[PDB]
Scaffold this active site. Structure first.
Site, short mmCIF file in Angstrom:
data_model
loop_
_atom_site.label_atom_id
_atom_site.label_comp_id
_atom_site.label_asym_id
_atom_site.label_seq_id
_atom_site.Cartn_x
_atom_site.Cartn_y
_atom_site.Cartn_z
N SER A 93 2.01 2.15 12.06
CA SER A 93 1.46 3.01 11.72
C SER A 93 2.01 4.43 11.64
O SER A 93 1.86 5.49 10.99
CB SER A 93 0.23 2.91 12.44
OG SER A 93 -0.32 1.69 13.14
N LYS A 125 3.09 6.50 8.69
CA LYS A 125 2.01 7.21 7.82
C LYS A 125 2.50 8.75 7.70
O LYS A 125 2.37 9.43 7.15
CB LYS A 125 0.88 6.52 8.44
CG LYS A 125 0.33 5.55 8.37
CD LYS A 125 -1.01 5.11 8.66
CE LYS A 125 -1.10 3.78 8.24
NZ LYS A 125 -0.51 2.36 8.08
N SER A 138 -5.37 6.03 9.90
CA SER A 138 -4.77 4.97 9.28
C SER A 138 -5.20 3.64 8.44
O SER A 138 -4.58 3.07 8.61
CB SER A 138 -4.78 4.98 11.24
OG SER A 138 -3.30 3.87 11.42
N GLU A 149 2.33 -2.05 3.49
CA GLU A 149 1.04 -3.24 3.85
C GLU A 149 0.51 -4.34 3.48
O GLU A 149 1.45 -4.56 2.26
CB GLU A 149 -0.38 -2.08 4.03
CG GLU A 149 0.05 -0.69 4.31
CD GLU A 149 -0.33 -0.55 5.94
OE1 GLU A 149 -0.26 -1.47 7.04
OE2 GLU A 149 -0.19 0.45 6.47
N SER A 162 0.02 0.56 15.73
CA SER A 162 0.44 -0.77 16.66
C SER A 162 -0.05 -2.25 15.56
O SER A 162 0.18 -1.50 14.19
CB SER A 162 -1.82 -0.69 17.61
OG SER A 162 -2.42 -1.22 16.61
CL LIG Z 1 1.12 0.06 9.78
ZN LIG Z 2 -0.33 -1.12 8.55
#
Ligand SMILES: [Cl-]
Ligand SMILES: [Zn+2]
Length: 261
Positions: free
Chosen positions: A43, A46, A103, A139, A210
């Site tokens: 994550s 991002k 997230s 994703e 994570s």
């Molecule tokens: Cl991710």
């Molecule tokens: Zn993700």
């Protein structure tokens, strides 16, 4: 250094592979542990995507307030904000806030798409001098962290330098740098990670991550009292595909840094 032996001992007891980069902006010194090994970002990428959209907004007036349609096909693995807006819209600012502070993976995918795909995020990294970061997928596959796979990886050294450039340096315009810092400071997911190893009076902006292989990450800009800001990246990943997340190992790394430097 005593710090490097404590970080080695932390890793030895941890059941995994630990990567740490700390930059002290008081004297621009750096402490690294596995600082040039690649780690899965999960994550934490991002931050790059949100920053790249902020850079777009410097020349595209009102871009952050542009509505973006959330469609049923956009929903992925973790959609706390976007799942309340399907068949509606969210602005690019709302998508950046959702990705950074909750997230939200659907929000991440909208940001990647706004940049022209994962290559667009990587191209922004290159434009600000990061030769190491690479985003290859979207994703939900970003949460898969196969050992040895260089896709969607960076090194602790490179992420610390980039995070410093984005939040304390000049990679972004002044309004954009402030907005990124504001977003990071309002993160809701970090209470058990780097923040849990720091004195509570220190100001922190951070992005956790994570994924599988027990991958547990956090990247932070820290404003202590009594000294200049720090940039701290902690990456952790484990040998077993279904290993449990170890946010407590990142908190330990943050404590070693907070007390030893
Ligand atoms: Cl991710
Ligand atoms: Zn993700």
């Amino acid at each position: 250094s005593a710090v490097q032996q404590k970080l080695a001992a932390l890793e030895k007891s941890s059941g995994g592979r630990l990567g740490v980069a700390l930059i002290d902006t008081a004297d621009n010194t750096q402490v690294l542990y596995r600082g040039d090994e690649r780690f899965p970002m999960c994550s934490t990428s991002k931050v790059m995507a949100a920053a790249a959209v902020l850079k777009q907004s410097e020349t595209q007036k009102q871009l952050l307030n542009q509505p973006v349609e959330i469609k049923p096909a956009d929903l992925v693995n973790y959609n706390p904000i976007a799942e309340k807006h399907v068949n509606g819209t969210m602005t690019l600012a709302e998508l950046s806030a959702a990705a950074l502070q909750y997230s939200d993976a659907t929000a991440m995918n909208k940001l990647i798409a706004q940049l022209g795909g994962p290559g667009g995020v990587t191209a922004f990294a290159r434009a600000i001098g990061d030769e190491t970061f690479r985003l290859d997928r979207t994703e939900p596959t970003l949460n898969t962290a196969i050992p040895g796979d260089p896709r969607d990886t960076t090194t602790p050294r490179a992420m610390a330098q980039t995070l410093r450039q984005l939040t304390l340096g000049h990679a972004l315009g002044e309004t954009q740098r402030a907005q990124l810092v504001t977003w990071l400071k309002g993160n809701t997911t970090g209470a058990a990670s780097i923040r849990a190893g720091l004195p509570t009076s220190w100001t922190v902006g951070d992005k956790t991550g994570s994924g599988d292989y027990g991958t547990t990450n956090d990247i932070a800009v820290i404003w202590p009292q009594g000294r200049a800001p720090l940039v701290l990246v902690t990456y952790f990943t484990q040998p077993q595909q279904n290993a449990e997340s170890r946010r407590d190992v990142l908190a330990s790394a943050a404590r070693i840094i907070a007390e030893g430097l």
